[PDB]
Ligand SMILES: C[S@@+](CC[C@H](N)C(=O)[O-])C[C@H]1O[C@@H](n2cnc3c(N)ncnc32)[C@H](O)[C@@H]1O
Ligand SMILES: C[S@@+](CC[C@H](N)C(=O)[O-])C[C@H]1O[C@@H](n2cnc3c(N)ncnc32)[C@H](O)[C@@H]1O
Ligand SMILES: Nc1nc2[nH]cc(C(=O)O)c2c(=O)[nH]1
Ligand SMILES: Nc1nc2[nH]cc(C(=O)O)c2c(=O)[nH]1
Ligand code: SF4
Ligand code: SF4
């Protein structure tokens with residue numbers, strides 16, 4: 001059984017796969033914040049830009065099993081087109097993403113990405129692992145495809161993240177009332193430390209979901 | 210001898226390497242347009258967003274040999290940092306980019322990308338080949354790392370391009386008076402035909418060179 005906030009078809013806005021058509025499956029619920037505003041200031045992750053509470057978004061709901069969820073995901077892909085790609089997010093997708101769902105998505109011809117905060121172990125059969133560490137949470141996933149660090153965060157040891165086992169090391173400016181400022185900080189960081197590259201939230205500039 | 214409009218250090222704004230720190234080396238001169246506005250209306254390539262005339266830009270000049278040019282490119286890289294990366298562009302870089310320059314950039318620890326219109330043979334020792342075909346020019350480069358097609362162009366056969374031997378197939382919206390329109394067309398093209406992914410000109414959104 002899966003609790004899903006919304007499922008939608010768009011381009012991946014972030015990370016190395018930015019620009020790529022993807023079905024986004026947004027699981028409800030996170031382990032670093034309740035999703036309630038009155039809780040935000042005391043939460044482990046306090047900067048979240050996302051509504052992951054409940055199952056009331058587009059295509060959202062409680063799915064009986066993996067086949068029902070996969071059916072809805074596949075249904076959003078253009079008929080007769082391949083390159084099927086799903087980005088599992090949330091919320092924290094590792095609270096709910098399990099092997100039977102991964103196997104059913106693979107059997108349906110999807111490549112699978114995850115967006116995860118890195119505080120929970122990941123399924124290594126996932127094809128694309130994006131880890132976005134939250135400075136005040138544990139980081140237990142220390143290898144993956146891309147480490148996409150939102151900056152600035154207090155308590156961050158940013159340069160050290162670069163010792164972890166990832167193919168790409170990205171900084172993503174924190175959105176909120178200081179986005180332009182954070183974007184300038186992020187560009188400068190990369191130019192001074194070019195192991196790192198910039199991940200913009202391109203979907204916000206394109207005004208697409 | 211090399212005629213170079215400008216050399217600057219920034220983030221690659223475009224293609225699959227978007228976000229990556231790079232020295233841009235912009236060669237002077239193109240085979241598809243004189244760069245003169247009086248000639249634009251009759252040129253093979255008519256939509257160019259770039260000034261590639263003369264050697265009067267930042268660090269631009271006539272370089273006596275490869276060593277000279279590599280010296281200036283290397284001097285823009287942050288001291289003590291690796292991941293050296295240079296994007297050769299212009300203008301049409303294949304008018305001037307030769308094996309000695311490729312060999313000296315490589316000797317200096319640079320990975321080398323090119324931005325090329327594809328109408329001229331490219332050197333296969335170049336590490337990253339980005340081909341952006343112009344609808345009314347010959348396309349002789351039919352393999353490479355990314356094929357980054359600016360859209361829309363009249364006379365374009367866009368689905369045919371996807372038959373070529375590239376790792377990535379991208380559409381980039383044509384900037385000009387219709388950029389927003391063109392951006393929506395490009396998003397829609399990728400969602401309908403998801404072999405294709407979007408290449409935004411992110412440096413224009415970031416307002417960086
Ligand atoms: C909403 S999270 C969901 C997946 C999981 N909780 C995680 O944090 O990766 C998806 C991506 O958005 C990023 N993000 C969240 N709030 C953001 C903000 N205000 N500015 C920029 N990126 C943000 C997260 O760091 C993560 O990389
Ligand atoms: C300035 S060109 C120089 C390299 C080579 N002459 C070429 O055309 O690929 C670099 C990139 O800018 C793209 N470009 C030029 N004018 C553009 C415009 N108005 N809108 C979007 N992309 C543009 C080109 O297609 C190319 O991919
Ligand atoms: N287009 C788009 N790209 C995204 N990449 C990560 C997102 C997320 O919410 O996990 C997201 C999102 O919400 N939209
Ligand atoms: N930041 C940035 N990225 C770019 N990618 C290709 C460019 C070009 O002029 O070839 C370009 C450019 O001029 N600036
Ligand atoms: S860990 Fe991810 S989903 Fe949870 S509050 Fe933070 S950014 Fe949002
Ligand atoms: S071929 Fe490249 S440099 Fe030449 S005019 Fe066209 S976009 Fe500009």
Ligand SMILES: [Mg+2]
Pocket residue numbers: 049050
């Ligand atoms: Mg989001």
Ligand SMILES: [Mg+2]
Pocket residue numbers: 258259
């Ligand atoms: Mg340019």
Ligand code: NA
Pocket residue numbers: 152153154155156
């Ligand atoms: Na900090």
